[PDB]
Amino acid sequence: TRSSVLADALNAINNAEKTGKRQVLIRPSSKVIIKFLQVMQKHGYIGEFEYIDDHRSGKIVVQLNGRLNKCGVISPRFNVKIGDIEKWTANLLPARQFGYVILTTSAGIMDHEEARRKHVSGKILGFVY
């Protein structure tokens, strides 16, 4: 029962961030993991990463630079209104002025600080600070 694949990815990236491995191998990556790691890559949290192709799973090796503290995942993925990202960026980021609660909209996977600007909101996914 791998239930949430993104949860296993982010777990592995924590466990091999704490212990200073500069690269990891996650499995069995999907679109959502690519989008999430693009969001983390965009604000400079992790380095370049790379999708291998077997015909089935799609493992990924992520080179990670070590700027990451913690990447999380919020199971279950709750529905979050625009009024709510106040209450999510106050539970689970360390300060007001960094970190990103990322969340899934219909406009596409995105951190909250852009989600205010395009002014949509959907479900939540994890969090990176």
Binding site: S75, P76, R77, F78
Partner: protein, 144 residues
């Protein structure tokens, strides 16, 4: 997965687990059993009032071994018979048998002021004349 089910459509089992586990506290059992209205001789009230049956005295718990001078009240609104403490020293001479005392509990939800084995209510007012003021000699107590 930390016990409880965190699933997004699993609210029912959350609130039904909770309702099963609220019958674990004391106070929530008190409310919904209606224990304040069945037992507990003040029938869900702060105070009550009653007729003094007789004046007694104690031989309480160790180390404080003494005779502490309680009384016997029969309440009016129930016919229950509950023992009662008279406050500040003296004041057993203020009450008599067959007088009208107003009771209230000690402040523990029942049990004790201290060593006292099974006395839970203090007397606030005899004959409507307010033991604080009698003990401080501010009013007087007519008989009956």
């Amino acid at each position: 997965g930390k016990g409880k089910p965190r699933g997004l459509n699993s609210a029912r089992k959350l609130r039904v687990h909770r309702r099963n586990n609220r019958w674990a506290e004391n106070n929530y059992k008190k409310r919904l059993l209606g224990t304040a209205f069945k037992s507990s001789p003040f029938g869900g009230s702060s105070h009550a009032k009653g007729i003094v049956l007789e004046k007694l005295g104690i031989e309480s718990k160790q180390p404080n071994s003494a005779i502490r001078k309680c009384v016997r009240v029969q309440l009016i609104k129930n016919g229950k018979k509950v023992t009662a403490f008279v406050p500040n020293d003296g004041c057993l001479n203020f009450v008599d048998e067959n007088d009208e005392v107003l009771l209230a509990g000690f402040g523990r939800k029942g049990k004790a002021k201290g060593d006292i084995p099974g006395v839970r209510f203090k007397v606030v007012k005899v004959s409507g004349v307010s033991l604080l003021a009698l003990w401080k000699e501010k009013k007087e107590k007519p008989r009956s």
